[PDB]
């Protein structure tokens, strides 16, 4: 049967979670997508010659630590932690997202990729080295993306699938 991979995209409002997701789903850059819409989207993709079903939860809205919201995030098998390379605050938020993922998955070993989005823009405020070094601190991959140009989009999502496979084989 076709394996389904439940992927969750997290990070500060405005970093490009929806734009990244829609680039994967529609193969189109959407510069405008209601910041409050949290929803999931499926797509069949070929990754290393194996057709699989991705189920992407594009998170949005207010931070809430109810049991209900924990259970919804807990359905995720892997997480993209997204910041924007021109927004230092979004990068400084990453550790909070990672901490909450570890808590809700009750694991120090959750499949995860650090994503630096908006790589097409010139206004960088977060050095690549600092981002690479944070991913190293966590022991996870770092991928530079642009939802505008499609740079890194498959790399980010497909690496996460590969991380989930390797975790499932542990
Ligand atoms: C960086 C923060 O801001 C926001 C703003 C919006 N969301 C968050 C946020 N943190 O984790 C999460 C997720 C969705 C991530 C996956 C796992 C779980 S499990 C659960 N219950 C979740 C929730 N709500 C989450 N989201 N944080 C700063 C710092 C604290 C005050 N605050 C202003
Ligand atoms: N130049 C550029 N703008 C982007 C990129 N991704 C998203 N945006 C813009 O960033 C803003 C927020 O994007 P959105 O997808 O709504 O972010 P979300 O709140 O994380 O879902 C919008 O103005 C988008 O046009 C990107 O890679 N490059
Ligand atoms: Mg959004």
Author numbering: 0 to 169
The authors write:
We established high-resolution cocrystal structures (1.0–1.1 Å) of the pan-KRASi (BI-2865) in complex with several KRAS variants. These showed a conserved binding pocket across variants defined by the α2 and α3 helices, the distal portion of the β1 sheet and the distal portion of the Switch II motif in KRAS. A part of the KRASi pocket overlapped with that occupied by covalent G12C inhibitors, such as sotorasib and adagrasib, with the notable difference that the pan-KRASi engaged the pocket without relying on a covalent tether and did not extend in the P-loop channel near the G12 residue. In KRAS G12C-expressing BaF3 cells, the effect of BI-2865, a compound lacking the Michael acceptor needed for covalent bonding, was comparable to that of covalent KRAS G12C inhibitors BI-0474 and sotorasib. These included alterations in the G4 (NKxD) and G5 (SAK/L) motifs of the GTPase, as well as several residues that formed contacts with the α5 helix in the cocrystal structure of drug-bound KRAS G12C (hereafter referred to as α5 contacts). Introducing G4, G5 and α5 (G4/G5/α5) contact mutations alongside G12C led to diminished inhibition of KRAS-GTP concentrations after 2 h of drug treatment.
The KRAS GTPase cycles between an active (GTP-bound) and an inactive (GDP-bound) state. The pan-KRAS inhibitor works by preferentially targeting the inactive state of KRAS to prevent its reactivation by nucleotide exchange.
